[PDB]
Paper text:
Nucleocytoplasmic transport across the nuclear envelope is controlled and facilitated by nuclear pore complexes (NPCs), very large, modular protein assemblies. The Nic96 complex organizes four architectural proteins, Nic96, Nup157/170, Nup188, and Nup192, as well as the more disordered protein Nup53/59.
The N-terminal fragment (Nup188N) includes residues 1–1160 and its structure was solved to 2.65 Å resolution. Nup188N is built from 52 stacked helices. They fold into a large right-handed superhelical ring that resembles a lock washer. In total, the latch covers an 1511 Å2 interface. In contrast to canonical SH3 domains, the SH3-like domain in Nup188 has a different β-strand topology, which represents a circular permutation.
Author numbering: 1 to 84, 92 to 446, 460 to 674, 683 to 885, 903 to 962, 971 to 1149
Write the structure that this text describes.
């Protein structure tokens, strides 16, 4: 009746051991809730799991899940297994009781883990180290006289030593099985908290962009069932959701304890080096996902004081855990979790301090809501929080510097409030003094709710401690650089650790700190730069999207607040405009960042674009040759106000294309330390920059009042142009197109000779690259990126112009006699700006071949002739890059993964689009790629990057954060695998090749077949490839190479098992079809050994 049953979460043992019921482990549940995940969340298994009342109890009270053993659970453990070929019930029983004793969980929970391990042994086999023979195969597939070094470092890391026969002897041992049990347990712990975190993100974010987002029935079902939250109710009860925060805060003390010691109840020599890392990694991961949850809950009541009990609970925790700073940090797995952990710690602390509402409340400038109560109301609260934050500031714990900084402001404001009331009181004391010395009431001070705390620390008469905290944090504490890093971590770029939604709401705390510190700090280089970083969040031009972070409206607050918030807008945003273009970077950076981020919000985009087109002022260096073209308007003694008596032209010859500012326009000099003037001249920033751009080309044929724009201003200015063009493009409709068109002509509204901004950027591009033919300069190399990005953005609005220019674009046009300039200029080195340049080219090339597919359905500059040489050069360059990537040194492996995915993608699209455009315009390009890979003159060297992807994928860390990193490696793998399949097909299709490329894939089959046990998204592309391999071998005139032969007996048994386990867990139609395709081709292509293995 009342007692919620365990049976749905833990099926009867018999149905598990048989294979009927596959237990939904937390790992699978977690994967079903991953950032991409959508289809998996629909499946009946997961739907039932999330709708289970028993599961709901674990969600509210996480200590239940792996709760300590009791006689109540010992009893259930006997009952659970008194219901029942030997899978050895006694071995399973032995293990469950061993596990329960070693990590001190209850026998039922241990039994759950034991079965999970048992039902995933096939996966365990494949994730183990390769056999020695397998390594020999990879080595031979690589086979280079020099580039085997990069192959060697990869093989060394794949972990190598095994004779397959004894590997099974190891695997079956009692020791090895129980290490797997510990690892399965640690895996389940990580996944449990990851699941809870991801579940809340799923519930609290309606209208997410998943597949068929009427996942609302599931959302509503869980909300009402687990948290009593009825959205359709009059006033929804949130007390249960709220209760999650104090609950999960409690779990954090545990994570911190475990992070310091393994349970002294665990058998020795389970304690390998591998186990210690896994143990620590789990504790940290649990901490990170709990904190993510806590934040989501706090953010439910944002713009409002948290409950004081919540505020003090958190800071008491930070006190006992020393702000989560002392952690054992040896391995890399542990290392990449530190920044995310610290980011959440800072953000949560800031969220709870709520520096913005706190300062406003102290100035009696805010009215509390019904049940709102600030922690400031109590001196006792403040006393506890103070010593904690002060201790962090004294120890110089780096990650806590934002908290120290925010607190120093709060302290100062309390001190000011006290001094004000003290003077107000001492004034009355002196009025009554005066009236008394003519020819008895001892007037006291106005009472505050924080005074007795102030006195206890002497902060009422001595504010030096607060000043010093700010000094520590801005100085040696490097809080500005620190927040910039946390903003990348909490960003929306490829290095981001968290969901964009969470990150966007968290970065908000950092922005509030800068909003308030601007009162004490001016408009200085550091806070400004930091603010730009917090806004940027590590994004770039390629990340620009037509949609908001998970379609969330409030996720864009951090961006929209730059407009709507009086302090940020006046102190930062409008402040940057008031000094543009005299100071170019900040204003230009900010418009680029905001417009890129605000694409989905029309009212915000119009305000930013409108400002660029209708800009009220202009700030520049005063030309001393204008000392008679102005009269002082008056007051004070004015270095300030003046009025232009004559007209002044910003641009002079040595034409009606000039920038003149009519007389009467008012101005103001802005330094007295220099000669800078702010002119109230309304104008178009874009139109102006376009003309500045044009002047820079003519090399002294013009005069500029604005000066020659430098390399940095060249980079920033074009990127802004690119971004704004791109943004306006994505906002355009079929009822309102030509938005990008308008932006192009608005920027071309001031040029000469019937010339466009298009021509200016293209001429800039060509001129730059002859200047960049010197090749030593990064800033110029970066400017090349911007030109390419503009060209990319310009492609959708005027395709023909871009194609027409690419024909003469010196970067590629190998053309007449190998005039390939991008290759020479990029190859020289492969770091920093060079990578960005090469990426921009690749990305632009990819859009070009995309343009040919939609051209087969304004366009005037595109002819078959031109499209053929352009795409041929692209193919030529793509192959060159792809091949060279083997030896190159990229900034990071994530960066390499982007490069490889996009370069291989280009070549894949060339072969795939050749038939839908007689040879055909894409034919020579497609032929170039085909001939490049089929010729064994270099095929034995042109396979290495393919294998590198294979091994990179095989070594993707097991993490539930850094999902964007995992999506990217997955896209690199998938793209390479699918490219390999198209190669095999085309090779068979024209009967050439077969030979080496097919052979190399067989040599690589040992790695390929292990992929499906690394990630779900790997499964279908890997299997699909092996099927294409088997089908190709069946088309060879002799007897096809045995696939079972290469993989070995045991690996094959495990692989085939998984192809059946592929069908099972989520019931996806696609998974079933790939197993069917694989088995069908095995049975039809003379792989008898594999065929028989299929049935055993």
């Amino acid at each position: 009746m009342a007692t919620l049953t365990d049976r749905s979460y833990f099926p009867p043992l018999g149905e598990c051991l048989s294979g009927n019921k596959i237990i939904l482990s937390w790992r699978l549940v977690a994967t079903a809730l991953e950032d991409l995940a959508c289809d998996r969340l629909r499946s009946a298994a997961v739907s039932a799991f999330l709708r289970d009342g028993y599961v709901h109890q674990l969600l509210r009270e996480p200590t239940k899940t792996f709760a300590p053993p009791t006689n109540e659970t010992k009893l259930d453990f006997e009952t659970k297994t008194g219901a029942i070929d030997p899978y050895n019930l006694d071995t399973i029983k032995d293990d469950a009781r061993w596990l329960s004793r070693n990590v001190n969980i209850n026998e039922v929970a241990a039994l759950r883990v034991v079965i999970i391990e048992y039902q995933s042994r096939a996966h365990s086999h494949l994730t183990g180290p390769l056999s020695t023979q397998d390594v020999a195969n990879v080595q031979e597939a690589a086979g280079v006289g020099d580039a085997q070094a990069s192959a060697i470092v990869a093989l060394l890391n794949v972990t190598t030593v095994a004779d397959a026969d004894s590997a099974w002897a190891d695997f079956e041992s009692e020791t090895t099985r129980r290490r797997r049990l510990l690892a399965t347990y640690l895996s389940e712990r990580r996944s449990f908290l990851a699941a809870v975190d991801a579940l809340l993100a799923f519930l609290l974010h309606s209208r997410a962009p998943g597949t068929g987002v009427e996942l609302d029935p599931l959302r509503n079902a869980v909300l009402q069932g687990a948290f009593g939250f009825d959205q359709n109710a009059a006033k929804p009860d949130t007390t249960q959701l709220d209760a999650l925060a104090p609950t999960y805060i409690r779990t954090l003390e545990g994570c911190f304890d475990r992070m310091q010691m393994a349970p002294e109840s665990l058998d020795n020599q389970m304690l390998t080096e591998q186990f210690e890392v896994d143990w620590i990694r789990t504790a940290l991961t649990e901490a990170i996902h709990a904190m993510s949850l806590i934040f989501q809950i706090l953010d439910l009541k944002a713009s409002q004081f948290a409950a004081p009990a919540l505020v003090t609970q958190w800071f008491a925790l930070m006190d006992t855990c020393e702000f989560f700073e002392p952690v054992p940090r040896g391995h890399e797995l542990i290392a990449e979790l530190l920044m995310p952990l610290h980011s959440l710690v800072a953000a949560i602390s800031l969220k709870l301090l709520n520096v913005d509402r706190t300062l406003s409340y102290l100035d009696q400038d805010v009215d509390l809501l019904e049940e709102e109560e600030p922690y400031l109301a109590s001196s006792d609260n403040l006393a506890q929080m103070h010593t904690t934050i002060a201790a962090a500031a004294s120890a110089g714990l780096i990650s806590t510097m934002p908290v120290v900084f925010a607190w120093s402001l709060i302290l100062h404001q309390m001190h000011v409030g006290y001094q004000e009331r003290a003077e107000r009181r001492d004034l009355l004391q002196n009025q009554r003094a005066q009236a008394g010395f003519e020819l008895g009431s001892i007037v006291s001070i106005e009472a505050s709710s924080y005074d007795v705390f102030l006195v206890s620390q002497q902060l009422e008469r001595n504010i030096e401690p607060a000043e010093n905290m700010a000094r520590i944090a801005t100085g040696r504490g490097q809080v500005y650089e620190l927040m910039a890093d946390m903003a990348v971590c909490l960003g929306s770029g490829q290095l981001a650790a968290f969901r964009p939604v969470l990150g966007a709401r968290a970065r908000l705390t950092f922005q509030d700190l800068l909003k308030r510190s601007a009162h004490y700090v001016g408009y200085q280089a550091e806070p400004v730069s930091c603010l730009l970083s917090i806004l940027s969040g590590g994004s770039q031009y390629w990340d620009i999207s037509a949609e908001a972070p998970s379609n969330e409206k409030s996720a864009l607050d951090i961006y929209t607040r730059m407009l709507s918030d009086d302090t940020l807008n006046v102190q930062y945003a409008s402040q940057s405009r008031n000094r543009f273009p005299y100071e170019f970077l900040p204003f230009a950076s900010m418009c680029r960042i905001l417009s890129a981020a605000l694409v989905s919000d029309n009212e915000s985009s119009e305000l930013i674009t409108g400002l660029l087109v209708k800009n009220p002022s202009l700030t520049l260096n005063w030309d001393p040759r204008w000392d008679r073209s102005y009269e002082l308007v008056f007051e004070e003694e004015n270095t300030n106000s003046f009025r232009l008596t004559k007209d002044i032209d910003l641009f002079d010859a040595a034409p009606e294309e000039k920038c003149t500012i009519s007389r009467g326009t008012f101005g103001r000099f802005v330094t007295d330390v220099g000669r800078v003037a702010k002119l109230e001249f309304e104008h178009s920033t874009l139109a102006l920059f376009g003309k500045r751009l044009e002047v820079n080309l003519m090399a002294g044929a013009y005069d500029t009042a604005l000066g020659y724009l430098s390399a940095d201003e060249l980079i920033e200015g074009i990127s802004l142009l690119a971004t704004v063009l791109r943004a306006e493009t994505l906002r355009s409709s079929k009822t309102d197109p030509d938005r990008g068109l308008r932006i192009l002509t608005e920027a071309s509204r001031l040029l000469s000779r019937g010339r466009d901004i298009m021509n200016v950027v293209c001429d800039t591009l060509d001129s730059l690259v002859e200047e960049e033919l010197a090749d030593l300069d990064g800033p110029k190399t970066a400017a090349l990126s911007s030109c390419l990005q503009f060209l990319h953005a310009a492609l959708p609005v005027c395709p023909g112009r871009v194609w027409a220019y690419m024909a003469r674009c010196p970067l590629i046009n190998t053309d007449t006699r190998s005039g390939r300039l991008s290759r020479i200029t990029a190859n020289l080195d492969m770091l920093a700006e060079r990578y960005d340049l090469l990426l921009s080219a690749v990305k632009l090339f990819s859009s070009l071949v995309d343009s040919a597919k939609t051209s087969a359905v304004p366009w005037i500059g595109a002819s078959d002739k031109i499209v053929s040489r352009v795409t041929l050069s692209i193919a030529q360059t793509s192959v060159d890059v792809f091949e060279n990537s083997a030896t190159w040194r990229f900034p990071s492996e994530v960066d390499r993964s982007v490069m490889i995915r996009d370069v291989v993608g280009i070549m894949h699209k060339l072969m795939l689009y050749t038939h839908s455009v007689l040879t055909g315009p894409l034919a020579p390009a497609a032929d170039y790629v085909v001939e490049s890979f089929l010729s064994s003159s270099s095929s034995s060297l042109r396979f290495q990057p393919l294998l590198a992807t294979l091994l990179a994928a095989f070594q993707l860390p097991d993490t539930t954060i850094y999902q964007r990193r995992a999506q990217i490696v997955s896209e690199r793998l998938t793209t390479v695998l699918e490219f390999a399949t198209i190669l095999l097909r085309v090779a068979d299709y024209l009967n050439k090749a077969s030979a080496g490329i097919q052979t190399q894939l067989f040599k690589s089959a040992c790695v390929i077949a292990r992929l499906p046990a690394i990630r779900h998204s790997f499964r279908i592309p890997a299997i699909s490839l092996l099927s294409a391999l088997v089908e190709s071998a069946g088309k060879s005139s002799g007897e096809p190479p045995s696939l079972l032969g290469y993989l070995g007996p045991q690996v094959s048994r495990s692989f085939i098992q998984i192809a059946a386990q592929l069908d099972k867990p989520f019931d996806r139609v696609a998974e079933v079809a790939s197993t069917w395709r694989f088995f069908s081709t095995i049975l039809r292509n003379r792989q008898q050994w594999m065929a028989n293995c299929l049935l055993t």
